[PDB]
Ligand binder design. Structure first.
Ligand SMILES: OC[C@H]1O[C@H](O)[C@@H](O)[C@@H](O)[C@@H]1O
Ligand SMILES: OC[C@H]1O[C@H](O)[C@@H](O)[C@@H](O)[C@@H]1O
Ligand SMILES: OC[C@H]1O[C@H](O)[C@@H](O)[C@@H](O)[C@@H]1O
Ligand SMILES: OC[C@H]1O[C@H](O)[C@@H](O)[C@@H](O)[C@@H]1O
Ligand SMILES: OC[C@H]1O[C@H](O)[C@@H](O)[C@@H](O)[C@@H]1O
Ligand SMILES: OC[C@H]1O[C@H](O)[C@@H](O)[C@@H](O)[C@@H]1O
Ligand SMILES: OC[C@H]1O[C@H](O)[C@@H](O)[C@@H](O)[C@@H]1O
Lengths: 121, 121
């Protein structure tokens, strides 16, 4: 069962465990790079790094996918855009009015899958 | 609404967006360092870095807290441990039989709070 729990007091300023995303891409996403840590192969070309500012989160994302992740694009609450990166195969799915919390997945020579954890508004 | 959606196919090796954790600790947790990104103050002492392997996740976690986070320890599904680090103040809460997805929180000079996102089995 997916949940969250807060521990501790009311002070300080909020932070997120997710800080940056880049991809390698060609016809597919060869790799996703999350907070600098590479997952996937060495093919394609490396994208610039998107670093989240304070309080900035993915609010909308379009992923093309089939057996792999073909393409990713996203927009943040601050109206900044990443991508599209990758190719034109697969089929498209969109998340809208969300707050992405975490990205897990699976990868070999390419990025096979993404598990997006998010809050749906 | 906290939610998960998977995109793509069945192949490759699993990875988590949450890759590494270290802390600065003394009496309290002065800071948590998530995938190399520092959150909190410069006091206490820097712990070694714990880095997750493919398919590895925090399965049990004990947090002592009060006004701040006093202490953290955890165990993984591969029987590895981190901590305990910090002091004996505050009171303990344990998450048992979980899969940690994300660690967010709030920090100033110390780690005021943690907001742990997880699957509860
Ligand atoms: O993205 C998969 C594949 O696409 C193209 O064939 C090239 O850009 C490769 O280098 C890359 O590995
Ligand atoms: O995801 C890679 C590839 O997987 C399958 O072969 C199909 O869904 C394609 O359209 C897609 O491009
Ligand atoms: O990443 C694409 C492909 O790469 C490798 O061949 C393996 O890791 C497969 O399981 C995976 O599907
Ligand atoms: O239920 C998900 C989400 O839906 C809307 O955005 C609002 O009603 C929020 O209160 C709520 O949390
Ligand atoms: O952890 C809070 C605080 O605890 C002790 O007083 C010392 O270890 C300090 O350096 C540290 O900042
Ligand atoms: O959390 C830091 C500190 O906050 C309060 O002072 C109490 O709950 C203490 O027991 C605890 O050590
Ligand atoms: O982190 C402990 C403390 O540090 C600073 O004084 C501020 O950021 C406070 O809000 C916070 O509670």
């Amino acid at each position: 069962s997916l949940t969250h729990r807060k521990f501790g007091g009311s002070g300080g300023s909020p932070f997120s465990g997710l800080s940056s995303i880049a991809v390698r891409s060609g016809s597919y996403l060869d790799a996703i790079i999350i907070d600098g840590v590479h997952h996937g192969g060495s093919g394609g070309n490396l994208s610039p790094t998107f670093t989240f500012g304070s309080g900035e989160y993915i609010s909308n994302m379009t992923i093309r996918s089939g057996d792999y992740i073909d393409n990713i694009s996203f927009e943040t609450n601050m109206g900044r855009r990443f991508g599209p990166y990758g190719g034109s195969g697969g089929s498209a799915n969109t998340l809208s009015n969300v707050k992405v919390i975490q990205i897990n997945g699976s990868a070999g020579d390419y990025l096979d899958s993404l598990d997006i954890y998010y809050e749906q508004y």
